[PDB]
Write a protein that binds this DNA or RNA. Sequence first.
DNA 1: ACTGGCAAAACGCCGGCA
DNA 2: TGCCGGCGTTTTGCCAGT
Lengths: 44, 50, 49, 48
Amino acid sequence: ADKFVVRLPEGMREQIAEVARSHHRSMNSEIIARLEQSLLQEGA
Amino acid sequence: TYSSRTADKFVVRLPEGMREQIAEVARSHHRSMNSEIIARLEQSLLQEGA
Amino acid sequence: TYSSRTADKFVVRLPEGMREQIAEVARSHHRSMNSEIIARLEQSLLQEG
Amino acid sequence: ADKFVVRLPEGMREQIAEVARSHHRSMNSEIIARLEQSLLQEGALQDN
DNA sequence: ACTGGCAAAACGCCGGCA
DNA sequence: TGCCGGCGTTTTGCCAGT
């Protein structure tokens, strides 16, 4: 599977981890889950 | 203090052809792939916060 | 070939305060002012057929 | 009036040129008129 | 007007960490 | 799974030279 290194702004770094644990999934699992939701919003 | 060389990098292991899917969106919205990802994350985050 | 350093350049004379207004919305959308301007112009044009 | 040089993609210049000619306006006038209505259009997204 | 191009930023990605 | 220095690149904002 291909990968993309994402330069992230100030806050996100930590804030992204916070939501991951509370969702009981890894960071990469969180980001991709959010990303697919966003892309699904476009299907409107 | 916080440039793009300083910023927090994070490898996102994309599912098959999802990368190509971001790309198409990124082009149409006239932003880099980085900015694309950021913009979507940022918005997804703020939805839960309001 | 047609890169960024090849692209047609047009000097836009902007009215009072439009600059900061555009820059603000540009950051707001995670985009360079250039891309920001192009994006809006583009959408304006196809809206007109 | 302050300046800002725009790099336009392939077909944009001629595209804008035509529309301007259509509206009997300067190219710069056309660009601004459009950038104007584009800004206050989404600036009118204060609760839709 | 135009447009080479500069200096600085951002980009994409590698290849190495832990 | 996560972290990141740093390379080689384009892009970006904005000039001066024509």
